[PDB]
Amino acid sequence: TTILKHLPVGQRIGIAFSGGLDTSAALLWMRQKGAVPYAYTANLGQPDEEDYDAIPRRAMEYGAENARLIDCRKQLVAEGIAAIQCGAFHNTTGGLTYFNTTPLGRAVTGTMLVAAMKEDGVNIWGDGSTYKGNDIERFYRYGLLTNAELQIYKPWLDTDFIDELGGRHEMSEFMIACGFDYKMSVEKAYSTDSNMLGATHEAKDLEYLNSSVKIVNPIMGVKFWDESVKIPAEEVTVRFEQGHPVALNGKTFSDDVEMMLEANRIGGRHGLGMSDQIENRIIEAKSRGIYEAPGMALLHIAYERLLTGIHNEDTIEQYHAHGRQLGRLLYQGRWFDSQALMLRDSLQRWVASQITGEVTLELRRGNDYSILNTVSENLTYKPERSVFSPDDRIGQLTMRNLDITDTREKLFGYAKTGLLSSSAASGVPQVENLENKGQ
Amino acid sequence: TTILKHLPVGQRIGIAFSGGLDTSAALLWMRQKGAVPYAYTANLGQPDEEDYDAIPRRAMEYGAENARLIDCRKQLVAEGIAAIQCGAFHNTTGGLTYFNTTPLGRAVTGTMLVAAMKEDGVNIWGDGSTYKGNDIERFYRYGLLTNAELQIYKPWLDTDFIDELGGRHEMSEFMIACGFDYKMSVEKAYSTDSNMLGATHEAKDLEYLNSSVKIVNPIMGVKFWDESVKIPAEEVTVRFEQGHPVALNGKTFSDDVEMMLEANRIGGRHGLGMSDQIENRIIEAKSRGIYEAPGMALLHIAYERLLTGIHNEDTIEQYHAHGRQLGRLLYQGRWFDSQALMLRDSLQRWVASQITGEVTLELRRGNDYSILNTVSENLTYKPERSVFSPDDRIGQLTMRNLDITDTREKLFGYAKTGLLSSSAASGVPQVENLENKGQ
Amino acid sequence: TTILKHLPVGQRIGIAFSGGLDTSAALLWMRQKGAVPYAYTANLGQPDEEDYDAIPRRAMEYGAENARLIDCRKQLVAEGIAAIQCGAFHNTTGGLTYFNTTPLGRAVTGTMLVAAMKEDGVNIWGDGSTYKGNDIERFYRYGLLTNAELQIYKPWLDTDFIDELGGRHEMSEFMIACGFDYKMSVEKAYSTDSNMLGATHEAKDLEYLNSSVKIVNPIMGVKFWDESVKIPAEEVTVRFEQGHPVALNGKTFSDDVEMMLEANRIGGRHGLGMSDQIENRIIEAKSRGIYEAPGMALLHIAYERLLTGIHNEDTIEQYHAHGRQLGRLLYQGRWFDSQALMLRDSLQRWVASQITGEVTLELRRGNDYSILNTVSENLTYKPERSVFSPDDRIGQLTMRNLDITDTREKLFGYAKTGLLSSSAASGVPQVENLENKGQ
Amino acid sequence: TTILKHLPVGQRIGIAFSGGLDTSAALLWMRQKGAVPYAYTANLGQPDEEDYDAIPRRAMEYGAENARLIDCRKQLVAEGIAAIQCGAFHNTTGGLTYFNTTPLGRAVTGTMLVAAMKEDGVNIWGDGSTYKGNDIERFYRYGLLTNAELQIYKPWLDTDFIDELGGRHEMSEFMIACGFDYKMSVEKAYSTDSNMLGATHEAKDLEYLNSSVKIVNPIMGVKFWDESVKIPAEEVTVRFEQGHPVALNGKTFSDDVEMMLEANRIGGRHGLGMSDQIENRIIEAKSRGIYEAPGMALLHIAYERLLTGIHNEDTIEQYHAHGRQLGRLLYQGRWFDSQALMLRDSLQRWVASQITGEVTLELRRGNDYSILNTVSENLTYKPERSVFSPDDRIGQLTMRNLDITDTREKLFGYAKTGLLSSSAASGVPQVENLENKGQ
Numbered sequence A, B, C, D: 001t002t003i004l005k006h007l008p009v010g011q012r013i014g015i016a017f018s019g020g021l022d023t024s025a026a027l028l029w030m031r032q033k034g035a036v037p038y039a040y041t042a043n044l045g046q047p048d049e050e051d052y053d054a055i056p057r058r059a060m061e062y063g064a065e066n067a068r069l070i071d072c073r074k075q076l077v078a079e080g081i082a083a084i085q086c087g088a089f090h091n092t093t094g095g096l097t098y099f100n101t102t103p104l105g106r107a108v109t110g111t112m113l114v115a116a117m118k119e120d121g122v123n124i125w126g127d128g129s130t131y132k133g134n135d136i137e138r139f140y141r142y143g144l145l146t147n148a149e150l151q152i153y154k155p156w157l158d159t160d161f162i163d164e165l166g167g168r169h170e171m172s173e174f175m176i177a178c179g180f181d182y183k184m185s186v187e188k189a190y191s192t193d194s195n196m197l198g199a200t201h202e203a204k205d206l207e208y209l210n211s212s213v214k215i216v217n218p219i220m221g222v223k224f225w226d227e228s229v230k231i232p233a234e235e236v237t238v239r240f241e242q243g244h245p246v247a248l249n250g251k252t253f254s255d256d257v258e259m260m261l262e263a264n265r266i267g268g269r270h271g272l273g274m275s276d277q278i279e280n281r282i283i284e285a286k287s288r289g290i291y292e293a294p295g296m297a298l299l300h301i302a303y304e305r306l307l308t309g310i311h312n313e314d315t316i317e318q319y320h321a322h323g324r325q326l327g328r329l330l331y332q333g334r335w336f337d338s339q340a341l342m343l344r345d346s347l348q349r350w351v352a353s354q355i356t357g358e359v360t361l362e363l364r365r366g367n368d369y370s371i372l373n374t375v376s377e378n379l380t381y382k383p384e385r386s387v388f389s390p391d392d393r394i395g396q397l398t399m400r401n402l403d404i405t406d407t408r409e410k411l412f413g414y415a416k417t418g419l420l421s422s423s424a425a426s427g428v429p430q431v432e433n434l435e436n437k438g439q
């Protein structure tokens, strides 16, 4: 079968190695119990990441047969840009959105790392994701899509691992007993996943709905909720050329990675894009997270402002509906499934291709900003857009008569069958349901 | 025919009378040219409205045969609450939404005023909406839905009116020549429509995309963009019972109108809910508006936060999709059409009925706020929600294999037909379209 | 845990007993190995069902502690009618649809049988569905929805059962060894599931795409594909009152069960509604089935013909879109989930409530029929429906100019960015994709 | 303005000339009153069309300054194929669909004829469509999309035309008085529009819902409802290669026009695809039509059978939903608008590109046929598709528990708020609405 319930002693095993305590201990344990682990680390432009070069070294020190560092930034940013172009975000609360940053990270990490392993000829793959979350499944699909022959081994799916190093304490103590002094004395009030597109905070104290963004130490921006933190208003311009972000505050860039890093700094100085979401997982249940994605948020606002001045109503509606559906597929680890590709490609080609122009914003604190100017050769919006006469409007209005008549007829029918208390004849038609009541 | 192209001399004519220069002059002119005008004014809880009682008096002074003041606040608020329960808003830019406040006002005004006129037996109806906008059509549909026998007369559809009193200057001069000293010396940088649910600002200087919220003097809140305006952070609680807003900051209310007035004050102190939208009209073209809806915004945020912790993914998705569609129908003057009623009723019954709970927010400036607590007997979200084992997850994952296999097969097929440069085998599948490029 | 991997020796176990070899052997085996099985059989109006009264008797003979026969026909038909009113069907090929008859049967069977067991105080539940199909999951959800305390035991989930009585031969031989002479000498070219709403045929020879309806012996109708079978044309009338089917060929009925039985006879004489579908299961993979549902098909055609003459475009579109989504949820065993109830209730209230009228058809062979008359007090369709003038049309057309202009502009932009070879200026705009080619 | 209310005496005027009495008389009248008419006729492969070469001759005889015959068959068939690939059909009744054949004809006719006129430098355009239908608007949009400078003149928009030649009798008498003996002694029981993709029949006696297909003399097939007409069963094969129809009954073709002509003959011998629809027009009201499209129907059935065996559930669902929306836009004369192109292109690229294979059918009378075989290198369907174990299924089922629990909770809540009479605890949950009742 594909999933190996227990350590395949003597076999080469590849593992997505982040350098954290989970994968550090798992690799040492895997080597200790007889397997031949290979470490694969992805450079994802993690905001707080000290030195990526060191991660492969610790893997070697802990027993990796070989350890590679794969740069995934170009690909991550390209997918992030695609997400922006498609409005591929679905978890929203009052207008604040989660920019699907971890899902984007897994789509690029889960495929590129497995591709890299093909050069080492290793055919057993795994990671350190818990068996209770979304990530173990995202990696699972992405990996098997990239390598069909792949077999799967994950410490959190092996009862022999969980019983021995199940707790963080057991993992620290294991490192110790193996001759390695690890440094995890610190246990925050939440766990953090991050990459160049954003940072996600959840678990521990964030599991409680009475906790708030106040306990979070943002790593991509400032604590805008802290009135003692100085944040001067800032004017910023964002310019797109055929759906592609090409300039921020008049500056252009050598590549998209640099552009995104700058979008992050700009939004970061204000705390732009931070949100608190209760969301539905891929599996049963719900989870709660607090997210950061300053650059994605900045690009998203400008892109949509331009979209509203360039495309027609039906096209804008498809962008919203298709974008939300795509956002869900991305979240489920299905970013490359046929239904996702179809929506993504269609939005990139017919919507994003016309998004050329520049938007000027004034950023203050958090999600408080104002739009100061919107410019584009492709606007269909025109001031004071003469074109038709009052007689023309008389004609148009008159041709609504039969539709109005039919609707009036339906109101009468709904009133008769009890769905409306009173039709339109006596004023406001009243829908007959529990919500039709005051306080 | 239904629409009378010219003044029906000698006939009773009802007119939606707001007291502005347009309807003041139109009624005087209608009486002057031989018609018998009746004025009907709606009390919509207009924020800046001096004294509604005076409007019917001026109508009488200008020639109205009779003048009535109809209170439409209870109905307006009830529809506003329904809108909140259904997320019936569709014009959004980066998460900021227009709360369809004018459309809600017209649905209640256009039906109630025509119903009232039935007591006076007047069968010719009109208003002072321009022939180039959305409102002339909203009033048209709502009126004909309420009274089938209705004939229609609108000064802005009568070439004899426009040629004589077409300009604001011609209207002031007309009042003057008729013995009335009007007071419109002031001509703002934009026009304003408002009611208890919100205020809309457009036209004139707002027609230009380089104008901003900075030229607007908000009438439902403060100028949060003005760093010189003091706005202390404020903690607020919003509580719902079966989809109905029943308490703000622990206070309950005698009726919904009072509740809404308080929601407005709370959001108003911060400038919550203000947005700048470029939108598609009912007819051809686009328009640009800057909107206020502090109470609607406050209720909307709390309602959706609760929704995310109470309902499942598919239900939340229907709320978004059906709400957006309903928002469009509301905007088009179709709030009581069968397709609208079906979506509204279904969301009120199955979604709103379970929205019971309380949300605590910390409001700062504009749309910058934080969520501090979310509580509800109906939450399906539970901290640390054991329930399944790693072996169970092995089973679940394994049963995805054939779907992954099929998707892998499609990637190969798309690569072969040229839609993807490279499948998943070599890393990240690359979609073949213009957007797949850097800067 | 909820699912017991092995026989709970000594415990009361309820089982959905159909009387087939699977459940006959499973109950005998369960009793033989020490459990205390209780049989629960549902009367579903199975077309070919000999005598339902005998099924509980054989259960007793094989070892059941107690055996009950629950009549589920009224409920089955009521849900079938709801399905018709909502167009809750999603598996279609060229217009021919699967009427979700097994899914409807499981929704009523899985809830009613578990409810019945509550009177016997039995808290372990199961059925004889294979672990590779949809039904084991439909029963699972429906059962747990009805009884939260329920524990689950299913022979096809017990490795101790499958290894002993895995094959049909092993089951026959087991009956024999236990002193019972069963009669299953016959093994068709496919398996059959049926109830009063329809019959489904799949597995065995139907697994092959080169097999056809030709190997099926229909149990609810005739072999219309057999030119040697005489099938005279027949005129039939179907009449609805507020969405409810109340008369067939002028005859009314004492209850819906009788009405459905007659719809079945009428459609049955022609083979109406039979289809061949390749469909996606709840889990991974696809299956192939050949279906019968003569009465459902007859009611479905008349209902939709009426719908098209009574409701407006947007309402009809919601019926199609919401009906398809509901059809999928019904198929997945989610007929009572909140997202399903919302769609079902909304369609019953706003669409079905107005479906009053009568349709006359001429039925020939299979799906070949003609519509001969459509009548309804609620039609909005009117012959030769004067109402507007050519001048009015000039106005309406003129007001499309700006939208046409904007679209023309987009064509130019798509041509420039390479999406169209040539805009509209040179004739037919050419979309740039692989499909734009001849043979 | 764009639309000229009266004959532009002395100016060159182009007119879509079909050769019927309407355009024959209009061109003679236009020339007689002083305009300089140019005739443009489209070769659309009309089934009953005698000799297209003669149409330009009669135009010349009646006064045309110049008369051209433009071949539009290749383009018409290419768009028809695109429609099939996208399932761009929306008017359906019980599974029978209108294949949008007139809308496809107008999209190609309205653009190509106007493009052709650019060579003659004529800038006034029109046609003979009535001011009360869909076509006058389809031609209007398509024409203005192709030529922005275009001015519009249509006899049915000119009160001076309608008053003089309003009736068919007045038109015959006009020809006569001008020295031309026309031949329209025959006035059928309905009017007919047709092209190579299909024939539409409406108006006159078809306006009555008690008329039926029985009064129609089909021009693309036989009277399958007439039991006296011999129609032997026929086996047919349809083969696609990358979404393109390439062989019928083993025969390939030099071009698509020939392929379509053959599809028509095959379906024609059986009357395949004929339907009776009540539909909503672009404007207010409904109309009734009886349609023929034998080849389109044949290709449509095979294409969808293949689609069901090749693509996954979500992709198939998008094909249905996007296809229906596209069908509506096509019907509205918006086949080249951005929202249409986006849906069409996305379906052609990601769905149609994989549709490779062959389907064998047995055609009998009308829409009575059977599927005999389905073959494809791209099928994801596999007979007897081992892959997972009962233990794996135990895991999968177990992971549904929390979702079931949440749904059970909602049932309890809906029961409490009165939406359900009884939850699931007592059997079948009962939705509280008018439809929950028997006969």
Ligand SMILES: Nc1ncnc2c1ncn2[C@@H]1O[C@H](COP(=O)(O)OP(=O)(O)OP(=O)(O)O)[C@@H](O)[C@H]1O
Pocket: A015, A016, A017, A018, A019, A020, A021, A022, A023, A024, A040, A041, A042, A043, A044, A109, A126, A127, A128, A129, A130, A135, A192, A193
């Ligand atoms: N940069 C990276 N390169 C490779 N794999 C990574 C990277 N970041 C995360 N992963 C993989 O994703 C898994 C889930 O990420 P997460 O940050 O939640 O890890 P974790 O379970 O806390 O483990 P650790 O304590 O080792 O970080 C990790 O166990 C690891 O296998």
Ligand SMILES: Nc1ncnc2c1ncn2[C@@H]1O[C@H](COP(=O)(O)OP(=O)(O)OP(=O)(O)O)[C@@H](O)[C@H]1O
Pocket: B015, B016, B017, B018, B019, B020, B021, B022, B023, B024, B040, B041, B042, B043, B044, B109, B126, B127, B128, B129, B130, B135, B192, B193
């Ligand atoms: N409170 C109200 N009661 C009745 N009718 C109203 C009310 N508010 C607005 N209307 C109607 O709606 C029309 C459009 O509103 P809007 O505020 O844009 O008016 P307007 O065209 O500027 O006219 P005026 O200058 O008279 O306000 C008004 O002409 C009037 O007929």
Ligand SMILES: Nc1ncnc2c1ncn2[C@@H]1O[C@H](COP(=O)(O)OP(=O)(O)OP(=O)(O)O)[C@@H](O)[C@H]1O
Pocket: C015, C016, C017, C018, C019, C020, C021, C022, C023, C024, C040, C041, C042, C043, C044, C109, C126, C127, C128, C129, C130, C135, C192, C193
């Ligand atoms: N009328 C019924 N009453 C109760 N349970 C039923 C009924 N019909 C079917 N079932 C249940 O549904 C399961 C699946 O139905 P299906 O007809 O496929 O059965 P099966 O696996 O072939 O078993 P059998 O050989 O016993 O019919 C059956 O095993 C049985 O538990």
Ligand SMILES: Nc1ncnc2c1ncn2[C@@H]1O[C@H](COP(=O)(O)OP(=O)(O)OP(=O)(O)O)[C@@H](O)[C@H]1O
Pocket: D015, D016, D017, D018, D019, D020, D021, D022, D023, D024, D040, D041, D042, D043, D044, D109, D126, D127, D128, D129, D130, D135, D192, D193
């Ligand atoms: N083959 C064609 N070539 C050019 N224009 C055409 C063609 N077929 C139809 N039309 C145009 O479409 C209009 C509407 O088509 P329809 O067949 O309904 O015509 P009609 O109004 O009955 O006129 P006629 O009596 O001249 O056919 C025609 O008046 C004509 O202008």
Ligand SMILES: NC(=O)NCCC[C@H](N)C(=O)O
Pocket: A128, A129, A130, A132, A133, A134, A135, A136, A202, A281, A287
């Ligand atoms: N260890 C992990 O990487 N966790 C799996 C991702 C799931 C995510 N934390 C969630 O439950 O929302």
Ligand SMILES: NC(=O)NCCC[C@H](N)C(=O)O
Pocket: A100, A101, A102, A103, A134, A135, A191, A192, A193, A200, A201, A202, A203, A287, A289
């Ligand atoms: N583990 C984390 O802290 N975050 C990773 C998952 C975040 C988010 N719920 C997601 O699944 O995308």
Ligand SMILES: NC(=O)NCCC[C@H](N)C(=O)O
Pocket: B128, B129, B130, B132, B133, B134, B135, B136, B202, B281, B287
């Ligand atoms: N006079 C009015 O009331 N104007 C019509 C409403 C239309 C709105 N101002 C718009 O054009 O967006």
Ligand SMILES: NC(=O)NCCC[C@H](N)C(=O)O
Pocket: B100, B101, B102, B103, B134, B135, B191, B192, B193, B200, B201, B202, B203, B287, B289
């Ligand atoms: N005239 C205004 O200032 N506002 C009224 C219309 C506002 C908004 N565009 C609407 O149509 O609802």
Ligand SMILES: NC(=O)NCCC[C@H](N)C(=O)O
Pocket: C128, C129, C130, C132, C133, C134, C135, C136, C202, C281, C287
């Ligand atoms: N034994 C069964 O009842 N089978 C489970 C239902 C699944 C259905 N036969 C299918 O696989 O399509």
Ligand SMILES: NC(=O)NCCC[C@H](N)C(=O)O
Pocket: C100, C101, C102, C103, C134, C135, C191, C192, C193, C200, C201, C202, C203, C287, C289
């Ligand atoms: N087992 C059968 O013969 N039919 C039952 C399932 C039929 C259909 N595929 C369904 O799952 O509803």
Ligand SMILES: NC(=O)NCCC[C@H](N)C(=O)O
Pocket: D128, D129, D130, D132, D133, D134, D135, D136, D202, D281, D287
């Ligand atoms: N003369 C025409 O070509 N008629 C306009 C097309 C409209 C179509 N007959 C309809 O009303 O459905």
Ligand SMILES: NC(=O)NCCC[C@H](N)C(=O)O
Pocket: D100, D101, D102, D103, D134, D135, D191, D192, D193, D200, D201, D202, D203, D287, D289
């Ligand atoms: N005029 C006809 O006989 N048919 C042309 C229109 C047919 C169909 N209602 C359509 O508008 O496409």
